[PDB]
Amino acid sequence: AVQKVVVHPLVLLSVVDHFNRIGKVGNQKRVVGVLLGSWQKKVLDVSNSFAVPFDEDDKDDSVWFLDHDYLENMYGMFKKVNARERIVGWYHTGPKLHKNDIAINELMKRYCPNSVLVIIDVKPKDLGLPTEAYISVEEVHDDGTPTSKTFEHVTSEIGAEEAEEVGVEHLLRDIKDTTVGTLSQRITNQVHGLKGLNSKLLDIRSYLEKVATGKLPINHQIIYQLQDVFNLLPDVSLQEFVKAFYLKTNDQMVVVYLASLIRSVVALHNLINNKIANRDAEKKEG
Amino acid sequence: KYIINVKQFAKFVVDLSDQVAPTDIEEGMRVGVDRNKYQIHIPLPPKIDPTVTM
Amino acid sequence: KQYEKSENDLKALQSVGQIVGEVLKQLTEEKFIVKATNGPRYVVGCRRQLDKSKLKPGTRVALDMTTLTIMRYLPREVDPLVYNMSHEDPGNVSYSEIGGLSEQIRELREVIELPLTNPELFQRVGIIPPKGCLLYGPPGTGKTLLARAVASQLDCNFLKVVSSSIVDKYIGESARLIREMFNYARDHQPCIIFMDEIDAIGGRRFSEGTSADREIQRTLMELLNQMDGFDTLHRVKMIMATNRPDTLDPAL
Amino acid sequence: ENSEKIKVNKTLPYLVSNVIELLDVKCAVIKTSTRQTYFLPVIGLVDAEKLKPGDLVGVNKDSYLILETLPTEYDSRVKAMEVDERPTEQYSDIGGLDKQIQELVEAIVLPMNHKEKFENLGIQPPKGVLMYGPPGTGKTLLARACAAQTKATFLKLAGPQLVQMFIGDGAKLVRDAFALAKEKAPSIIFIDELDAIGT
Amino acid sequence: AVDTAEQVYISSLALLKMLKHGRAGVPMEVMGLMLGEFVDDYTVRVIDVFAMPQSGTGVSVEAVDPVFQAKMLDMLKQTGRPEMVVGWYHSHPGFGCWLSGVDINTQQSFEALSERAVAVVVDPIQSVKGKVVIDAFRLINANMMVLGHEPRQTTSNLGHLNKPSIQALIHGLNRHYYSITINYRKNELEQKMLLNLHKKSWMEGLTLQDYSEHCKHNESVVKEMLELAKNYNKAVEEEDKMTPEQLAIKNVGKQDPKRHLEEHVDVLMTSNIVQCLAAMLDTVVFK
Amino acid sequence: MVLESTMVCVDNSEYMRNGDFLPTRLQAQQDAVNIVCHSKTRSNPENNVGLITLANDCEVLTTLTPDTGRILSKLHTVQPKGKITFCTGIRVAHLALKHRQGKNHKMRIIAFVGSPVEDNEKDLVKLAKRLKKEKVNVDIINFGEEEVNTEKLTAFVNTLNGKDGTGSHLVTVPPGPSLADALISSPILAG
Amino acid sequence: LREELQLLQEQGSYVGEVVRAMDKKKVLVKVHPEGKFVVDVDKNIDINDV
Amino acid sequence: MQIFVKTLTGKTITLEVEPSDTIENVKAKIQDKEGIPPDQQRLIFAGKQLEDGRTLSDYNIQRESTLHLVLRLRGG
Amino acid sequence: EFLHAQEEVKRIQSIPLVIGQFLEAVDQNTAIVGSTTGSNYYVRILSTIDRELLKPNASVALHKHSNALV
Amino acid sequence: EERSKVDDLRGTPMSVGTLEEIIDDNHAIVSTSVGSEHYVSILSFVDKDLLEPG
Ligand SMILES: Nc1ncnc2c1ncn2[C@@H]1O[C@H](COP(=O)(O)OP(=O)(O)OP(=O)(O)O)[C@@H](O)[C@H]1O
Ligand SMILES: Nc1ncnc2c1ncn2[C@@H]1O[C@H](COP(=O)(O)OP(=O)(O)O)[C@@H](O)[C@H]1O
Ligand SMILES: [Mg+2]
Ligand SMILES: [Zn+2]
């Protein structure tokens, strides 16, 4: 019953660290570590974490090794330095996940009952794509379909702390993106707010034409999850929109009509005071 | 478990340091209080004894 | 179990402590002017969900030690001088250790038990529910066991004032103790108040009287206006008890 | 490992204070001897059911945690009145007043010695005995010998010592003399020259 | 030997360990060890910083059993990468940044055991608005007090990177220790993704301001510039028609010029021209 | 003073739920672990012994550690109820020998086969040619039931250390009240 | 605006009432909450300031 | 015998001590060779704290043993 | 940069702070204020604070560190 | 030269103290202006002849 997780801006920096702590000699091209958290009531929080030596062979894709003794000491070391933080799960990077992630999860559920994984992106960082989290659930599948795992998605957000947010602003120092914007940042928030829109909409038809052909089998779960999108968008016809839209559009044109009136008197007064001061310095210089 | 006041700051429950012995320390006696750990370093006698020879 | 006691102390060890303060007024939607018990005055805010409408100008809150913003509000101090005036057992009696007084017992049970149980009999008749009564007479016939009887039956809240631990060396302490007493009694609505020996702070208010007795007169004038004054005393009834009902104030 | 971590983080320098009230929604308001008020969600080592308003607990200077309690403090005048451990005295030292001696042995020691001697009959022992008559005969000296043999934590009380200069001192002093008498269960109370405050 | 061109290279995830461990114990002076690498004589980097458990009070801080440190560094060799330590840190929450009594004693122990061992001071309760007062200091020997102390000007960039304030030069500067310059090792795939996750949005641009309080907010903006226009009518025209001094008390301590009356107009446009155009897209986009 | 990483590999398959011996096969294989962990202790205290299963999953119960008290707590209560899976058991043991804290120890893997193996001859020779290219010596000890002179195990011992290798002895115990006397004659010293 | 902001990030200054003091670049300043202090003069001011 | 005091700073200090010596002698030798007082030195042998009240033969310290030098960590 | 300085002055004042009293004014952009904890101070003021509001001993705001008339 | 070294050996913001009593062992008890009494040491260039209680 996880609503959402809160990833502090510290742990992903430790992943980017440990993505570079192995890349000098390692060709593993995935980083698997241990996620520590603070399960408060219903929302999940992640403050600190660490990593663990893990490898995986591409042949037979079922062989793995976790270091339990390093997990027992270092989590026990963190408990002594901070008896607030505890285990909440694990994490791995790489978009394409290997299939030992059920085998890793079902082992370390002996540590955490509500075990959770967090997928981050180190290289796919160009578009708007945050970190990703799933959940460990065990059902059959749907009704009469064969049994499997089916990691369900839990939505994720990012939240800092008081020093963890003020220390960020001192680091950037390049554009800094001020609060409430002066008509230039706000339009770009609608520009790149829409650049991610059709990128989702191109992605829907790409999976749809993949399954309209029939290569991969269908999932009925996504069908009605897509079907309530199209028969719940509004249709603007008469007396519910076209009356009520002008009632707030002809409302907001009255107050910008003051901006036409007031700002014209502002620059006119600055014109008068300069044309007085110009001709009076001119007539008295000679 | 010595209860000691400053009468300007507070009352403190402190201990003697490991330089003196818990033999001379009685009730109503000045001590040498550490500035940070507040420990009794050296006990002070209340200006003994210019009232016997006279 | 010994491990569970250890881990509770580990969670207890990571604690800060909070600055007790009182809200003076509200400046804006997020600016509150508070003040500590001796420290300066601050301009702080609330956390996330504190229901700022409950922040009345004169409540008591608990500030953060470092952020200094409001963590949790508190009802009221209860000034431990009167803490002992509530926590005591009367006699575990049940009107069976008393006799030969049933004409006066029931008449006292009439004036007290009805407003704290049965207000419908007082709405049907155009009368205000009454205030407290008085016990006077020679020493020996009840006067303490009778209040001990009624504080065993339906003890919602109870205060027993000795009327002789209420003054001291300090000249403005006496009337301050009475005001903070009734506010505890007012807040815990269905309370009953007992005061033995009204003769100790009674007296007729007379002329020039060697200022040690002037304080008792100023103490009594505070007791007058708190009983029947500007504040509508509701759900609070007062059993007064004396031994010589001759030298009391006619205004009392 | 946990008890070792409690021990090292337990510093010895404390700060005495006073509990004002105790709430549950466990929580206690603490006023220190620095004239400062503090509030904590969790008390700490001691229990919420063992405290009372008016205790001199040991509080941390920085985290403000109730570490130890052990108050046992009173007024200097009340502690001056605790007079015990006298040389003994026999009842045969008083001659001629032996009936009043037997009326004391039939008054005080058997409520103390044999409580089950009364609880089967259903009666309740009294608790007030007066010595009166000519001065200098048997008033203080009889109860001196009764406290000498039957040790029951003697506590004298003088008459004019209750009369202080300032207003509202004897009501403090008498009531503090009996809060000490209530906490010491085998203790007794002896009041002398009661006519000096007896109007 | 000693230069005046040293720059410590702290990482971004180093400094986030510094403020979080410093804000964790505020009234008890947290205390940890700083791990990095000496790449040459006079540039030192530090990327990952661990912490140590403490048992100290609000003015001094002690340590714990030293079987924790060597067991920690042994386990950090097999996981990630190994290093040797380059210094230490603490938190001075009350005052600013200067090295106390036992702070110089532990500095003498580390520069003799290890090589040079830069110490770092952090005020956790000062880094509040937008700025941090973190600084690093470094002990100088007392024997070379008749010649230069941080001598031998190689460059000229050592003057505008640090200007010691009056509260700093009274304790140890410059007769006891000296200060050292700090830059930030910022790179890619760490810094860009730091802002690709914090100050981002998807639907924030195409979302209405929920007119229950939008046009309600514009009531209390028109009425206050109404009063400023009441104030503006008399003010300028009376000042110009009585005395043409272009000066006093309407110059020295005033606030009602033509700077105050258009910024309320400036807020009222940006809050509404965006809000007008945000309700224009969904008429086309959403059928 | 030999520096190696001895990796013991017990079997908790379902076929261990019987006694062909007068004692329990689980008690027989448990005491087999006791006499080899005490063997590697007295020879050099600078080694490490770690247990690993292979039945239905190769769950790392204890990490390869120089302590023995963690192993002795976990040698008991193993609950053998799984199906034997041997082809992944070598690759997970070699993956455990790569994740070590020191790369100066030698490599020795002992395994306990208490159930018949049903594997392709290609799958054993690919693992055998892998360990030749990795220079890894694996000992194979048979428990309980055993087909005498198997094709798969004998060709795996041959293709392990061919052309004057180490001498990884194939222990063939007969059924009966014989204890690990066949396991302490040659393999406790001449492995 | 940067000039007003740079001097803003600076601690406050005390006040001390001085009626008379001594010479030799040391003056006698008595603060209000505490007692007197023998302090040093600045180089931007003179000494004849009694 | 010769010992290898493996410090935590990547520097191995070789000492010439005897098996019948104690810890205070090693601390004095380290102080004479460098300049660290004995009260600010914590010798660790295989994760075990060494006490000044015992000798080197009590902790099974033979020739060529790996030690760990930890200094007194305290700030203010 | 000018929009930076507007936001900097904006968030210099929205913080928890102490309350002192205005005592006196030296000249333009400098005053003498004393807090409620005794210990009369000497700080500088801002230009946003209107100078025609500070005749009496009025209630003012002060920073905890810079201690200025915020 | 020697006069300038000792005039700069002490701190510059010198605080006005108050003597209470004198012990002839290179230290004494003093009193601050707030009445806090500090068991401090006394130097040797202090010209120990005019030192009076008060
Ligand atoms: N009317 C009564 N009925 C039954 N018992 C009584 C009555 N009056 C007194 N008692 C007995 O007296 C004891 C209580 O004393 P009581 O409260 O009457 O003293 P008091 O009248 O309050 O004295 P004072 O008036 O001097 O305060 C009880 O033990 C009770 O048994
Ligand atoms: N019957 C008696 N036997 C022994 N001593 C007596 C007797 N009567 C009086 N005294 C002496 O007289 C003294 C006064 O008695 P005390 O108890 O003080 O009476 P009061 O308290 O009324 O003065 C006692 O100290 C006691 O020694
Ligand atoms: Mg009575
Ligand atoms: Zn420090």
TrEMBL record, chain C:
Quick one: which residues bind Mg(2+) 1? 144
Enumerate the residues binding ATP 6.
Answer: 140-144
Q: What cellular component terms from Gene Ontology apply here? A: cytoplasm; nucleus; proteasome complex
Q: Where does ATP 2 bind?
A: 99, 140-145, 243
The record's subcellular location field reads:
Cytoplasm; Nucleus
Q: Which residues bind ADP 2?
A: 99, 140-145
Positions annotated to bind Mg(2+) 3:
144, 197
Under Gene Ontology molecular function, one entry of this record is: ATP binding
Task: State the UniProt keywords alphabetically.
Answer: Acetylation, ATP-binding, Coiled coil, Cytoplasm, Metal-binding, Nucleotide-binding, Nucleus, Proteasome
- What are the binding positions for ADP 3 in this chain? 140, 142-145
The entry's ATP 1-binding residues are 99, 140, 143-145, 243
Limits of the AAA+ ATPase domain: 129-252
Annotated Mg(2+) 2 binding sites: 144, 196-197
Question: Can you tell me which residues bind ATP 4?
Answer: 99, 140-145, 243
Q: Provide the protein name.
A: 26S proteasome regulatory subunit 10B
Q: Which organism is it from?
A: Homo sapiens (Human)
Gene symbol of the encoding locus: PSMC6
Coverage span on the entire protein: 52 to 303 of 403
